[PDB]
Amino acid sequence: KKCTTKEDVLEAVKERDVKFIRTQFTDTLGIIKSWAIPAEQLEEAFENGVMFDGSSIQGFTRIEESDMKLALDPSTFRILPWRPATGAVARILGDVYLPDGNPFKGDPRYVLKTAIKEAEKMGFSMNVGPELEFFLFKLDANGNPTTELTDQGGYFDFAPLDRAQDVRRDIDYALEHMGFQIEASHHEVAPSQHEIDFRFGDVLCTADNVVTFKYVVKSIAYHKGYYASFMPKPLFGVNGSGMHSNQSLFKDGKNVFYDPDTPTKLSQDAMYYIGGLLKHIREFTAVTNPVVNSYKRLVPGYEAPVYISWSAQNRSSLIRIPATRGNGTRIELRCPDPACNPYLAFALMLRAGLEGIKNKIDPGEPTNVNIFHLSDKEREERGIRSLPADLKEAIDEMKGSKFVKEALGEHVFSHYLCAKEMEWDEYKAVVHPWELSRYLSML
Amino acid sequence: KCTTKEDVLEAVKERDVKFIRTQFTDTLGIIKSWAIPAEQLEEAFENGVMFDGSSIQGFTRIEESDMKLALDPSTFRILPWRPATGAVARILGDVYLPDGNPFKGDPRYVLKTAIKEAEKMGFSMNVGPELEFFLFKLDANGNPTTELTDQGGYFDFAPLDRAQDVRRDIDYALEHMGFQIEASHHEVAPSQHEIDFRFGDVLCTADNVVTFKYVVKSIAYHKGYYASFMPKPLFGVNGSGMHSNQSLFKDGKNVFYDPDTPTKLSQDAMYYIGGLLKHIREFTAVTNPVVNSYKRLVPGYEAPVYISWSAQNRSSLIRIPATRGNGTRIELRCPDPACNPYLAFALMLRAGLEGIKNKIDPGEPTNVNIFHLSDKEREERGIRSLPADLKEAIDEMKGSKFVKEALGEHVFSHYLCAKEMEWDEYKAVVHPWELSRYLSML
Amino acid sequence: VTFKYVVKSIAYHKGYYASFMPKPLFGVNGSGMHSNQSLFKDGKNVFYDPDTPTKLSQDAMYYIGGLLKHIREFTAVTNPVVNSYKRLVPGYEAPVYISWSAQNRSSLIRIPATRGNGTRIELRCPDPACNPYLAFALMLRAGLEGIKNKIDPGEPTNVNIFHLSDKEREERGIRSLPADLKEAIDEMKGSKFVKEALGEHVFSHYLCAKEMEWDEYKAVVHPWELSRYLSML
């Protein structure tokens, strides 16, 4: 049954011996945040809100407002798929308020809700189906994460068939009976790599679910003796991990990307939505691909795209349009990796698409050729631009962008860019073992 | 018997089936799968399932990659393990392009076309396959090795230790998903085993050979061992083959049997053999698919490296067992377990059919030891060899119109480009045998 | 011959090892024995012709033509072991394509800039495992029949041969050296030119021993096979 009121939640806590409640939120960068509330404190939390330190979201960097209130949302209450001896555990989410009663604009979830409100002002709602690729590694003798493989299978192989076969099934079962409604899962291209495909769904509940997925999957794997890694590129020379984001807009339950009267059966407003996405994706690549290691995945030779193009036929464009029509018409954006903040990243896809629809942004021609095999002049003649090559280059693009600044809000915009600037400055000064291998003998 | 999607959904509910697995192969015989939650199954039966065709045909080309699997309810089978989370089952189906026509690059589709062509003459094919594997140890980290589990030989009662129980559990698991073993025995090499399955229609049999490999492997892994289907994992002992016994039936009767001929074989039996002998060189690349396959096809062991048929010599490339009647059969001995069985059985079927349509004489049987003859002696007999390595098998197949039409152009070309890349990789490797032979010498 | 065991003895005695394997390490250059040769007659270089624009005699061209006509027939002499054909793979110094040129320095046969007395032809396929007596004997025999029979070597190949298609090479008629020792053995087994130049004794002794060598190698199961297939099949 569906939890709608706090009394539904409080009744369900009683009936199922739920002993601890975990809040679930993200900081600016997409790190999963939480704290533990005993069941005994929960009714008061529904009454007065819960005070907490906003530095958890916005960092310690600046003197700003820091005592926030979490107004719990009973419809986000969901029992977690493990039963400790101590009792059942659940998660819940909420809205963060400043002491004056105004919503805190720096919560990524509020940022998505404002994009939702914009789409609603135009009569639209957005669905998303994410595709989460990940790696299943071994723990070393101390229980630490490693990159040790659990299998050497490839794309859609029925692998692994040892003990890890049971762990993979466990992860699937836990999500399904949490209530995820997985559509499918397969082995992906690289050794020990996997993909679980979410059901298409309301964008807010989807972004909420992507965060929950990350730690449920890690906890299941850890407790079985394995490690689930959402690194974009843990291993050189094999495929990285992405989070392709299929999406569509609806006007009261009618897919707005479908139009049965056109030769492709795609609507005009679908193409404008693509045009807006292609117009701004460079300016927020730092959001969808947020760490240094993201751009080791954004290199040629694998499932990762590097060139800004759209296409139906070519399964490797940045924007790909599946063959499905009718209600399930969607466009797939392939560049994002799973290290991103899904709230900030879905919100900017939605804002970009809504601008393309509002401004009639023609996306141009589709690129059906292999873009890797082309020359610069051909790409230049085609006008085929490439995504930022590294995090610094992505940051600078974002820095100059008033679209991204408006969509995210100045708080989030500036907090994000400062911290990413600092991480690159830490990365750039490191002398890597590859440098000694190449240069120590030589120089 | 599973006949309808309503039979399946009821059995899924009744037997607590929580996960369904699809089951298919790519162009190169690799087994492929994805997992469907049992909550998705009713929608899957109604709408099909969309999946990436790069699973079957690879990534090397821009071609149609959005396929649809239409689930076939009569291929639903519960797997022989019971996880705490609930039961598991495998299912197959037919693959469709978005425009609604069948996808021709599916190896199962290639076999149906051979079945469909053979039905234009009123012929149907049965297969009883004999699968050899090695039961090896795992190392400390749970990974495969070639370390022996026993030192027994042909038809020995061995192992008698804990691996005695693994072998039994493997035979038990297959029998109780409905494989109907005829017999299993220890094979010539140490730690080598063979399971002989009952005769069935070639489509059911090819589906079951795919199921068998991952079932056997998963059972062995879960008991702490490894089941290996390499052709030649170990130098200087026997390799593993997939001998493929076959019968053709018409009007209910065995096409190969004739009670009135001296050997009690029908004429079409000899024509079927002639067709196989004519074309076998041209699809050794399919029945013997990897580089390691031609370390098994060297003289000295159970492997047949010469093209000939016989009833008397057990080691001829084509053998006729003494059984007559409705069980008259033809054993084609050269294949190994790495082959795509949909592609192998279809090519055998077409080749046999070609022999019957064009009345291809098989020539004389070879009743002697072909190894113990000279190179001129066998040329006196006109006895040819099977290709000596993968590159040679590739070159024989690239120039074959029979193979190209039987597989279709998409399969033919994909298969050849991939195998050509595999050989171009292997031929540049500097092996440790070369250092041992040459480092001091040169 | 003196060079190989003097170097080996010197190296051993100082704590090192000198290796003439054609290809001891994968993925880095193999080792060749490049063979510069010149013909002389009455104290003058047969290959040099001042009055031609290129300054190469017509006899130089006939000598290259003879080498090209016959190099496939005795690659098993110039490259005599299994490991020879792991250097005869694309990507490194070693040729695999039967061509000639001056401007391209990759060529199987190259003509350096040198003119006058130092005019020479360079054959780049041999490696230091070959028998120099047999390899030079067949070099000289092949070039001599090119001069005897006025064998025209065709056009030089100045482009990068790797960057072409088998249609491009089939258009140009650029053939490949034997890819492994078995292919070289078969090619030599049928050459009447190699048999007559070497004599029945050497010809048959050499081929029987090389076939025995191949049969031993072809049956071995290599670790590369266990890495690739053991977990997969």
Instruction: Reduce the secondary structure of A48-75 to three states and give it as a string.
Output: HCEEEECHHHHCCCCCCCCEEEEEEEEE
Determined by: X-ray
Q: A152: which chain C residues are within 8 Å (Cβ-Cβ)?
A: 231-232
Specify the 3-state DSSP secondary structure of B298.
Answer: coil
β partners of residue A255:
A250
Q: How far apart are CA A342 and CA B409, in angstroms?
A: 44
Q: How far apart are CA B180 and CA B400, in angstroms?
A: 37
Subunits with 3+ C-beta pairs closer than 8 A to C: A, B
| CB atoms A182 and B37 under 8 Å | yes
Q: How far apart are CA A336 and CA A202, in angstroms?
A: 19
Q: How far apart are CA A341 and CA A25, in angstroms?
A: 10
The angle formed by the CA atoms of residues C46, C47 and C49, to the nearest 5 degrees, is 95
Omega before B159 cis (within 30°)? yes
Q: Which helix (H) or strand (E) holds B51?
A: strand B49-52
- A133 a catalytic residue: yes
| Amino acid type, B41 | L
Specify the 3-state DSSP secondary structure of B371.
Answer: coil
Strand order across the B49-52 sheet: B49-52, B66-71, B93-96
Please check whether residue B348 is in contact with residue B244, taking contact to mean a CB–CB distance below 8 angstroms: yes
CB burial string A363-385: b at 16+ within 10 A, e below: beebbeeebeebeeeebeebebe
CB burial string B387-407: b at 16+ within 10 A, e below: bbbbbbbbebbbebebbbebb
| CB atoms B290 and C23 under 8 Å | no
Please check whether residue C64 is in contact with residue C123, taking contact to mean a CB–CB distance below 8 angstroms: no
Most distant pair of Cα atoms in chain A: their distance: 72
Q: Rounded to whole angstroms, what are the CA distances from A97 to A63, A102, C71? A: 18, 6, 85
Q: How far apart are CA B292 and CA C232, in angstroms?
A: 12
Q: How far apart are CA B161 and CA A167, in angstroms?
A: 29
Specify the 3-state DSSP secondary structure of B436.
Answer: helix
Specify the 3-state DSSP secondary structure of B377.
Answer: helix
Q: What is the dihedral of CA B95, B100, B102, B103, to 10 degrees?
A: -70
Q: How far apart are CA A38 and CA A36, in angstroms?
A: 7
- A188 a catalytic residue: yes
* A158: phi then psi, degrees, rounded to nearest 5: -80, 85
HSE-up of residue B95 (Cα within 13 Å, Cβ side): 25
Subunits with 3+ C-beta pairs closer than 8 A to B: A, C
Please check whether residue B279 is in contact with residue B359, taking contact to mean a CB–CB distance below 8 angstroms: no
Q: How far apart are CA B279 and CA C87, in angstroms?
A: 35
Closest chain C CA to residue A157: C232
Q: Which of A152, A161, A192 to mutate to test the interface with C (most CBs of C within 10 A)?
A: A152
Q: How far apart are CA B151 and CA A239, in angstroms?
A: 42
Residue indicated by tokens 């873009």: A371
Which residues of C sit within 8 Å Cβ distance of A? Answer: 231-232
Which residue of B143, B232, B389 is in closest CB contact with C221?
A: B232
Binding residue positions of C for Mg(2+): 34, 122
Please check whether residue A138 is in contact with residue A146, taking contact to mean a CB–CB distance below 8 angstroms: yes
| CB atoms B50 and A165 under 8 Å | no
- A351 a catalytic residue: no
The angle formed by the CA atoms of residues A60, A65 and A66, to the nearest 5 degrees, is 55
Alpha-carbon gap: B431 to the closest alpha carbon of chain A (Å):
22
Q: How many residues does chain B have?
A: 442
Q: How far apart are CA B214 and CA B77, in angstroms?
A: 14
Binding residue positions of C for ATP: 38, 105, 110
C-alpha torsion sign, points B223, B229, B234, B237: positive
Please check whether residue B273 is in contact with residue B255, taking contact to mean a CB–CB distance below 8 angstroms: no
Structure tokens at A168: 């993979």
Structure tokens at A270: 């679908």
Structure tokens at A398: 């974002």
Q: How far apart are CA A273 and CA B46, in angstroms?
A: 31
Q: A151: which chain C residues are within 8 Å (Cβ-Cβ)?
A: 231
H helices present in B48-183, as ranges:
54-57, 107-120, 162-175
Structure tokens at A363: 């996306």
Alpha-carbon gap: C161 to the closest alpha carbon of chain A (Å):
20
Q: How far apart are CA A246 and CA A329, in angstroms?
A: 9
Specify the 3-state DSSP secondary structure of A114.
Answer: helix
Q: How far apart are CA C98 and CA A361, in angstroms?
A: 57
Which residue of B31, B34, B98 is in closest CB contact with A186?
A: B34
Residues 6+ apart with CB under 8 A from C216: none
Q: Which helix (H) or strand (E) holds C220?
A: none
Structure tokens at A82: 């493990």
Alpha-carbon gap: C107 to the closest alpha carbon of chain A (Å):
28
Please check whether residue A248 is in contact with residue A326, taking contact to mean a CB–CB distance below 8 angstroms: no
Active site residues of B: 52, 130, 132, 187, 194, 243, 314, 331, 333
Omega before B299 cis (within 30°)? no
Tell how strand A310-311 and strand A319-320 pair up: parallel
β partners of residue A258:
A266
Distance from the Cα of residue C169 to its chain's centroid? 19
Which residues of A sit within 8 Å Cβ distance of C? Answer: 151-152
- How many residue contacts between A and B have a Cβ separation below 8 Å? 83
